[PDB]
Amino acid sequence: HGAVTSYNIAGKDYPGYSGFAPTGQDVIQWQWPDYNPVLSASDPKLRCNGGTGAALYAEAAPGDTITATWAQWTHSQGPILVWMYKCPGDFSSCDGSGAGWFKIDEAGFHGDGTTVFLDTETPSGWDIAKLVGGNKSWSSKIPDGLAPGNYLVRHELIALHQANNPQFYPECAQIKVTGSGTAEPAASYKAAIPGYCQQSDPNISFNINDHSLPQEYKIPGPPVFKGT
Ligand SMILES: [Cu+2]
């Protein structure tokens, strides 16, 4: 349970949408309803937690840092994914559809698999554990050379504490990427969302408490796009 509540982009502060009590104030973040998980990989809410858009954008150049903050976050097992999506034109006509989503950042499981397992709570072998406990942040570089334009950026945490019962927590925000890069990820780096994973994939629904499995976690979605 939790959501990205605010951002720091290229050194500037951007408040998020206030899911539990919208203020009516202009923000860069697409709407989100509350802290409940999306429970199915094929649910359209998986994309941007049912948001439709936003009035503002943050400026950023390639190589600039995107930092998202989770005012609250409770789970110590599962991956972090950060994606981007090139809007064809105006942010207002961008719904995030088709296979435009590419990963720019990811973190998964780094435990040794014999004292720290996939299901171990403390000390968790997942980078997500570092987001737990209030006002924790995650920073990602906007890939070098990225062609300029209007982009969405999507943060997604997938909690895996419950055997066979994945829990997705996503949000989208609006980034106007400046400069004169030309790099665009190839089709093999891009996915649809929902679409990049199936509910029954072995890194999505599986028995995390089963210590006889390999203690490695393949992060879902395509390889990360690095740029140049
Ligand atoms: Cu939760």
From Swiss-Prot:
| S-S bonds | 48-172, 87-94
Q: So what does mutating residue 167 to A/E actually do?
A: Decreases cellulase activity and O(2) consumption
The positions annotated for binding O2 are 161, 167
Keywords of this entry:
Carbohydrate metabolism, Cellulose degradation, Copper, Disulfide bond, Glycoprotein, Metal-binding, Monooxygenase, Oxidoreductase, Polysaccharide degradation, Secreted, Signal
Q: GO annotations under biological process?
A: cellulose catabolic process
Give the catalytic activity.
[(1->4)-beta-D-glucosyl]n+m + reduced acceptor + O2 = 4-dehydro-beta-D-glucosyl-[(1->4)-beta-D-glucosyl]n-1 + [(1->4)-beta-D-glucosyl]m + acceptor + H2O
User: Known InterPro entries for this protein?
Assistant: AA9, AA9_LPMO
Note accompanying the cofactor annotation: Binds 1 copper ion per subunit.
- Taking the record's annotation, the residue ranges forming a coiled coil are none
Positions binding Cu(2+) in this chain are: 1, 75, 169
Name where it mostly resides. secreted
Q: GO cellular-component terms in the record? A: extracellular region
The molecular function terms of the Gene Ontology recorded here are: metal ion binding; monooxygenase activity
Tell me the cofactors it needs. Cu(2+)
Where does the record place it? Answer: Secreted
Sugar attachment sites: 135, 203
Q: Quote the EC number.
A: 1.14.99.56
Which family does this protein fall into? Belongs to the polysaccharide monooxygenase AA9 family.
Q: What is the name attached to this protein's record?
A: AA9 family lytic polysaccharide monooxygenase D
Organism source for this protein? Thermothelomyces thermophilus (strain ATCC 42464 / BCRC 31852 / DSM 1799)
Q: What taxonomic ancestry is recorded?
A: Eukaryota, Fungi, Dikarya, Ascomycota, Pezizomycotina
- What is the primary gene name for this protein? LPMO9D
